[PDB]
Design a protein around this ligand. Sequence first.
Ligand code: A1AGE
Lengths: 300, 297
Amino acid sequence: FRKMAFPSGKVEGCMVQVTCGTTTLNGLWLDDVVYCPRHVICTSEDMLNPNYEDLLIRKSNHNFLVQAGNVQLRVIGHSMQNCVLKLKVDTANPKTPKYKFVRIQPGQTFSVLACYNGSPSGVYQCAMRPNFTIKGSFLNGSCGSVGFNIDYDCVSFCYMHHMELPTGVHAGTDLEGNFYGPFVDRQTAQAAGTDTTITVNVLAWLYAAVINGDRWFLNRFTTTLNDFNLVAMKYNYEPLTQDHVDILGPLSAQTGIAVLDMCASLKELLQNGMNGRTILGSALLEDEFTPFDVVRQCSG
Amino acid sequence: FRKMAFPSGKVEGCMVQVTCGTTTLNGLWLDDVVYCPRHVICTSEDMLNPNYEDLLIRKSNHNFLVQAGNVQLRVIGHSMQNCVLKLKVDTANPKTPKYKFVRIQPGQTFSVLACYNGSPSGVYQCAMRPNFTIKGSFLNGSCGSVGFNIDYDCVSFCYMHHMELPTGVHAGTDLEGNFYGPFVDRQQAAGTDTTITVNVLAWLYAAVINGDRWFLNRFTTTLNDFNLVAMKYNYEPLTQDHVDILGPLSAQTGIAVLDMCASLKELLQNGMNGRTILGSALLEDEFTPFDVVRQCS
Ligand SMILES: *[C@@H](O)[C@H](C[C@@H]1CCNC1=O)NC(=O)[C@H](CC(C)C)NC(=O)OC[C@@H]1CCC(=O)N1Cc1ccccc1
């Protein structure tokens, strides 16, 4: 069972390079607007306490170099929305997909297209952590890389990349420029709040392992929802809600394992460990597959 | 470290569907040729022990329905190369990238663009196991999905999907239609699998690059002595090509390949002794030397 990203071609056709001064990162070109992180306008010194409105009013359209492949796009206007800059260009992107901007919830997954100098480099699946970080793979120059889901022909953009934290996890914004989490686009070492494990996702994954013939971790027992949730919170697992239980129905039907029966299996794993065994290849309980993800991939 | 696929857009621009009767699978459209698994020409009854040569003689161009989306592509010629069908079409694919056809070695990784009815569903990284199988996520209708790597702007196609083995792993061919491994497109067991030594060594190099180097020792080994030990632990023997592709990581860390082999040999013989490497007690074997350099840089 495989962590699978959405096909990235519709997003690749939107990625451009944005340069201001000696800073280069990526931008997302939709119709005649390029979206990018606003910290592109900051210098070494600005970045410790950047007064962005004051820094932006001092910029001219020609201070922004936007390049799509070999071609330069002419910036004819700019504006700032929260932590994103919106560069109006004189050319429409003919590869603009059907799209929307969404703000995702913790526990939801999305695909990241990691880009450098406006060129796509890799694609992988991430989850919005309960503490609003993401465990990404982002190096210098990756800012402006985006995260997205696809439904039919519509790209739902949910993430734009801005920073890496001292622990090696990542933080960013939605496409309205609002950060996920308590982070700020200044050049400071920032810690996240305590992370927790996405319980509804671990349960989806356990069901996926059953669907794939792996059942060593099952047991004959059950648990109530509240008693499960007491043990969950003790182990820094998120509470499981009745909506989560409802969401897991399809995987429950399929396998004929009641949700609360799988909860009792997970409780045993938290208390007893895996004893060196592995599940779906992993020595660790995996929490970045949603129920939808498991079903979407057991469906086609 | 994450499994990271290559961006799939250049390959999405080449996917089509190929139907013969009611059997639809995926094909790859490059210039004026569509490549797909030859078993598209088989009914269920032929799938037992098909006579592909006979089946292909009974076929004509007008029996093949090739479609990009719902747009038919006219077939003007057909031929068989090993286990792939090549359909000449009357239109050169305007989205053809720079490409080549490569046959990869066990241990090498590649991106799979899983497709159904010519439409991409997902992309993910696979490693060719030493027993010439991959652990895919392939369902009915996935055949003809391809595996690839991208270098600069050149797509190297290395895999086309054909079948699922009893144990739930996957087998297929290169783009010249030669199966990886001893498999045939009929109605077979994968050889017992082994650990991909060259990738474990890449993973130890990765750990060193990140400052996790407790396992380095003061000794070395010959390649023969290491290979003989490794096989007792169900690890693949190293080839000269493996030594060579570890060269960049050896040079980045200053740790000779054979010195790293001696460190690995000690881990195998003594175990981890309760310690971890890059946070795990398990040694990862699905990241190549190129994967490591690509994520550390
Ligand atoms: C895109 O411009 C980059 C992307 C990051 C670079 C390395 N990996 C990334 O994901 N974004 C930035 O560099 C951020 C810019 C500010 C928001 C203005 N800054 C940033 O990511 O800082 C990262 C460094 C490295 C690790 C860390 O903890 N850190 C913060 C820091 C800052 C100052 C002193 C000490 C630590």
